[PDB]
């Protein structure tokens, strides 16, 4: 009986507030930093077109076994062929059309399978595809793809993830002499509990497809989550550094909540932004075939 965590804040900025992402995130910060994650719905007219080279988009997804940690004790696809596989998997698993499966049912079934010792569900995830390989999901004035006059406002938009500031201030940067990543998801494909490198911000955009479910923990409960992890994670991974342990830190949010860790959830739909604040532990899974883009900013 999985209990859905409370909903994270959702913001619907007007066209005035939507003029600058960094200004908007700083003003919603007093609330969103207390929940770890937040969702931002752009104005209804803001619809960036999909600019990925779909004709050339090929990738080999990684294999995910949902119950790999509880059990302790691949084809190359195009975007079309992966989606046909993703839709056939979900429609066969739930025995109904893909768009008719309630998001609460996929959520309850995902967490049952993760801890299931009898059912071994295996899915695939097109994870960590660089935007340099086939182009960003957003229009970019890089001269390698045709940008129409109606699309130029999106190539120059501050909410275009390619236009987010990524350079961190340091003395090393002045003594010296990032790009968004793409995620093609299917039903039950997931990412486990982790924080971004250098406790960085991260913004995620779902270009199209089925929703992506998120779980977020505010930064003021980061040490409590890490303590709960060490107490409940397998002992063979107890001594591993964070950069490696984060690869195998899948945990039911109700287990964290039972130990007093505040967890917030949300369903990121197509065309919606999710922002993760510094040192906000987050995890989640995809409701079905979708396409997401994410970048770290500061
Ligand atoms: C956390 C490890 C993890 O579960 N995986 C599998 C899932 C895909 N992938 C991801 C995904 C992700 N965010 C989800 C975005 C989305 O899927 O839309 N963040 C990272 C990451 C890794 C190191 C440092 C910072 N971030 N890696 C690779 C490792
Ligand atoms: Mn990440």
From Swiss-Prot:
JmjC domain mapped to chain residues: 153-298
Subcellular location: Nucleus, Nucleolus; Nucleus
Residue numbers covered by motif GSGFP motif: 135-139
Binding residue positions for Fe cation: 194, 196, 282
Residues binding 2-oxoglutarate: 125, 202, 204, 212
Residue ranges occupied by any JmjN domain in the UniProt entry: 8-49
Family: Belongs to the JARID1 histone demethylase family.
UniProt disease annotation: A chromosomal aberration involving KDM5A has been found in M5 type acute myeloid leukemia. Translocation t(11;12)(p15;p13) with NUP98.
Domain notes: The GSGFP motif is required for the interaction with SUZ12. The ARID domain specifically binds to the CCGCCC motif and is required for the lysine-specific histone demethylase activity. The PHD-type 3 zinc finger is required for the interaction with histone H3 di- and trimethylated at 'Lys-4'.
Quaternary structure and partners: Interacts with SUZ12; the interaction is direct. Interacts with the viral protein-binding domain of RB1. Interacts with ESR1, MYC, MYCN and LMO2. Interacts with HDAC1; this interaction impairs histone deacetylation by HDAC1. Interacts with BMAL1 and CLOCK. Interacts (via PHD-type 1 zinc finger) with histone H3 unmodified at 'Lys-4' and (via PHD-type 3 zinc finger) with histone H3 di- and trimethylated at 'Lys-4'.
Summary of the function given for this chain in its UniProt record: Histone demethylase that specifically demethylates 'Lys-4' of histone H3, thereby playing a central role in histone code. Does not demethylate histone H3 'Lys-9', H3 'Lys-27', H3 'Lys-36', H3 'Lys-79' or H4 'Lys-20'. Demethylates trimethylated and dimethylated but not monomethylated H3 'Lys-4'. Regulates specific gene transcription through DNA-binding on 5'-CCGCCC-3' motif. May stimulate transcription mediated by nuclear receptors. Involved in transcriptional regulation of Hox proteins during cell differentiation. May participate in transcriptional repression of cytokines such as CXCL12.
Protein name: Lysine-specific demethylase 5A
Organism: Homo sapiens (Human)
Residue numbers of the full-length protein present here: 12 to 587 of 1690
